Design a protein around this ligand. Structure first.
Ligand SMILES: NC(=O)C1=CN([C@@H]2O[C@H](COP(=O)(O)OP(=O)(O)OC[C@H]3O[C@@H](n4cnc5c(N)ncnc54)[C@H](O)[C@@H]3O)[C@@H](O)[C@H]2O)C=CC1
Ligand SMILES: NC(=O)C1=CN([C@@H]2O[C@H](COP(=O)(O)OP(=O)(O)OC[C@H]3O[C@@H](n4cnc5c(N)ncnc54)[C@H](O)[C@@H]3O)[C@@H](O)[C@H]2O)C=CC1
Ligand SMILES: NC(=O)C1=CN([C@@H]2O[C@H](COP(=O)(O)OP(=O)(O)OC[C@H]3O[C@@H](n4cnc5c(N)ncnc54)[C@H](O)[C@@H]3O)[C@@H](O)[C@H]2O)C=CC1
Ligand SMILES: NC(=O)C1=CN([C@@H]2O[C@H](COP(=O)(O)OP(=O)(O)OC[C@H]3O[C@@H](n4cnc5c(N)ncnc54)[C@H](O)[C@@H]3O)[C@@H](O)[C@H]2O)C=CC1
Ligand SMILES: Cc1cc2nc3c(=O)[nH]c(=O)nc-3n(C[C@H](O)[C@H](O)[C@H](O)COP(=O)(O)O)c2cc1C
Ligand SMILES: Cc1cc2nc3c(=O)[nH]c(=O)nc-3n(C[C@H](O)[C@H](O)[C@H](O)COP(=O)(O)O)c2cc1C
Ligand SMILES: Cc1cc2nc3c(=O)[nH]c(=O)nc-3n(C[C@H](O)[C@H](O)[C@H](O)COP(=O)(O)O)c2cc1C
Ligand SMILES: Cc1cc2nc3c(=O)[nH]c(=O)nc-3n(C[C@H](O)[C@H](O)[C@H](O)COP(=O)(O)O)c2cc1C
Lengths: 187, 187, 187, 187
């Protein structure tokens, strides 16, 4: 059974990005032998988050869940042409090679189609600094296009990305350290 | 008289990055008609910061000081091959075109020379999303090289960067909106 | 008197990107004491270009003109989410710190607004590897928007970028090495 | 049986980058049921390459071989903090979604460890613009470290990257369009 974890990073209440991540998580769980959880970074204790204080139980639990996942859905609104500081603050407290062995799906929403590349030029390299095994294609949605609630063209692309993410998940322990530059030195 | 603001973004106590930003701020003030301040992002209220709550006086003051600056020194340790979430969280609460008219100097420290490009590929585009007028060359220092406390080669490069930053400062009101895509629509 | 050089990098005949670069060059020359030239990379000898063979007079002349410029207009269509190989091939043959002292204006056209960031995440860091003094804001135009031939909103942004580029030009020899990490070691 | 294609993009004769790509290609072929070829971009006809002239047989053959590959090894020296114009010129002539279904391994050599990130921030996004299925970790080598001819630490990392690349290859036709945003619209 796979463990899928979504991480969504809008600091805004009523996040469209969170709804997109939730849609993706449900889509995957409906089609694979998986359980999941959704870490809303806004709901973590701000002081403990920024300080990396793992004596805070809920923060520690989020970090552990991320490290134990087979696949991560990583979702952010575009802020200042990149991922949010809130999301990055969470990523910052994971272990150096936290994503070894894991598949990943980058998702974003933005106000303008002009910032589609923020995922591939911005978030993708950060995931790769963490030894990630397989990051599939990024999907970006313009705020308006949202409202299974979007134009058919956009919906196909989204569903295809989530399909690929699900297909990329690994059920073999032989893959658990892949992506790490020195697998024997753990993951 | 110029207003220079340094912003340093390590979540760590006893920050080498903060010391580097402080050195740069002093260097500039010693050689120009300038006053300055140093915003240590770690010292802002974490909840108000992540929420963009400007009813918090100290946070509001930091934002106002940044908006009123003629030059910004923007300093971060390299975390996960990019700037810190803590720094980006601060940038996230500035107005859309907050940096219109302003000069800027990107500084970082890291554990490895392998991540020198995180400034130019990572931070530089974010500053440009904010209508920044002139971002001079980046300077990156490897943690060890630190201890006016470094190898002569490194010191020359650092001092040259800070020199250029100082020279790039503008004393003319005609430049106040430069960098903004629609100057008449403010800055 | 300033020397302005435009470099345009579409491998396609009848380049919209070339027309945009030509517009920008004319705009600058109409408003400053400047002379200019427009290097169309497609018109350089392909073998000599890819080999960096400076025994080819026309290639050598282009390189010399670039090195002697006070400002460069650097224009590319977006190919595969970045600048063209053709443009980069030209940049590759310039000296290591070829752009020391120089102002620069990044321009592009693309088929989709989705790749606006290719300039700031892609081309901007390359210019900074060359000791460039001041790169002003990027301007990107979607192919359709073209036809002083565009929507008023787009035209304002373009003209503002070119205005800023012109204003950023330096008439003082004291600036000739600025941007170089070791000015005394030339430029 | 897998088809593996290496593409190496140094414009320099006696390329260390080419030797690294050749090592990687041999490593993969020694451990999987694979045949391979090595496209040295410098050996393609410069005029036909820059013009995308597929009436040139050798260029057409290279493009076809790339499109027919199950895995690509993509190798470049670092020039001006990014991949070479020569390499990008080749990538530019591939079909829009040329890499659909394919695994990929990014390799580089450079003069300085300071540009390690050029692969992940520079080349990786370009491969993803082409619908690539799985790009494993990047490997970068400093020119000196070269001479199975390097320090044990570096050799382990290289071999691990090539191992992962080989393991990522797919023998199932069900994967042939994965990575493409609209699989039914081909690849
Ligand atoms: N080149 C292109 O493809 C096109 C882009 N656009 C963009 O689509 C936009 C319409 O969306 P919006 O109403 O703006 O919704 P939005 O989702 O972009 O903005 C939401 C809120 O966040 C604020 N905001 C946006 N960007 C910000 C920033 N960088 N920093 C701080 N706050 C920010 C806005 O003020 C707004 O209140 C147009 O305003 C235009 O910017 C529109 C047409 C074409
Ligand atoms: N290719 C290159 O140029 C070379 C790079 N290096 C690097 O220099 C390093 C020596 O510096 P360090 O002792 O590591 O000091 P450091 O300043 O890099 O690390 C400080 C602390 O942060 C932790 N840390 C580092 N990276 C982290 C990450 N991505 N996520 C979470 N925590 C992280 C470390 O565990 C350490 O406790 C070597 O370990 C090596 O990584 C060394 C030689 C050459
Ligand atoms: N998210 C967004 O903001 C939106 C993006 N679009 C894009 O605008 C496009 C309309 O422009 P086009 O007719 O395509 O003109 P174009 O200027 O994009 O393409 C020109 C030619 O180059 C080819 N081409 C395009 N991309 C290529 C690639 N990556 N590799 C190789 N060849 C390539 C095309 O086949 C075409 O023949 C739509 O097709 C869509 O892609 C449209 C609406 C919204
Ligand atoms: N921050 C860091 O980690 C450190 C970086 N380094 C770098 O390692 C270097 C030693 O290697 P090199 O002898 O330079 O061999 P190289 O492999 O870097 O250079 C090969 C040739 O290409 C030329 N070249 C290099 N960069 C160029 C550019 N951007 N444009 C045009 N031509 C270029 C050089 O002149 C040289 O002739 C030092 O010079 C230093 O730059 C050295 C120590 C530390
Ligand atoms: C402070 C701030 C900065 C923003 N910066 C950008 C941006 O740079 N590019 C963009 O396309 N949208 C930008 N936006 C718009 C958001 O990305 C967009 O509204 C997004 O859908 C919000 O998602 P959410 O509902 O999950 O918070 C910004 C919004 C805010 C509040
Ligand atoms: C969580 C974490 C992640 C780090 N990631 C990187 C990295 O990706 N690249 C790097 O060169 N150094 C990395 N480092 C090392 C720091 O950049 C380095 O120690 C820096 O000098 C710390 O600056 P400070 O004293 O101001 O906090 C990381 C350190 C930590 C704690
Ligand atoms: C091979 C090729 C690749 C392209 N890749 C992109 C792309 O990645 N993103 C984009 O927006 N447009 C892309 N385009 C469309 C061109 O950027 C667009 O047509 C541009 O305006 C051409 O400019 P030109 O007339 O100067 O050649 C591509 C076009 C071609 C021929
Ligand atoms: C024109 C030129 C530009 C270069 N730019 C860089 C650079 O930006 N960063 C770097 O680390 N090395 C740079 N180098 C050094 C090469 O990356 C290095 O020598 C590489 O190993 C050459 O590989 P090759 O033997 O396959 O040609 C450059 C070399 C040349 C000739």
């Amino acid at each position: 059974t796979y463990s899928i974890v979504a991480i969504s990073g809008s600091p805004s209440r009523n996040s469209t990005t969170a709804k997109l991540a939730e849609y993706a998580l449900a889509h995957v769980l409906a089609r694979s032998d998986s359980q999941g959880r959704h870490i809303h970074v806004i709901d973590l204790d701000p002081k403990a988050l920024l300080r990396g204080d793992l004596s805070n139980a809920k923060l520690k639990e989020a970090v552990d869940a991320t490290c134990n996942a087979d696949g991560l859905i990583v979702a952010t609104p575009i802020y200042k042409a990149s991922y949010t500081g809130l999301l990055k603050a969470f990523l910052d407290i994971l272990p150096q090679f936290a994503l070894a062995g894991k598949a990943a799906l980058p998702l974003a929403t933005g106000g303008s189609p002009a910032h589609v590349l923020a995922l591939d030029y911005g978030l993708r390299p950060v995931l790769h600094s963490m030894g990630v095994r397989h990051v599939v294609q990024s999907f970006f949605m313009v705020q308006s296009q949202f409202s299974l609630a979007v134009e058919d063209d956009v919906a196909s692309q989204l569903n295809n990305a989530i399909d690929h993410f699900r297909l990329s998940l690994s059920s073999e322990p032989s893959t658990r350290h892949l992506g790490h530059p020195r697998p024997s030195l753990d993951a």
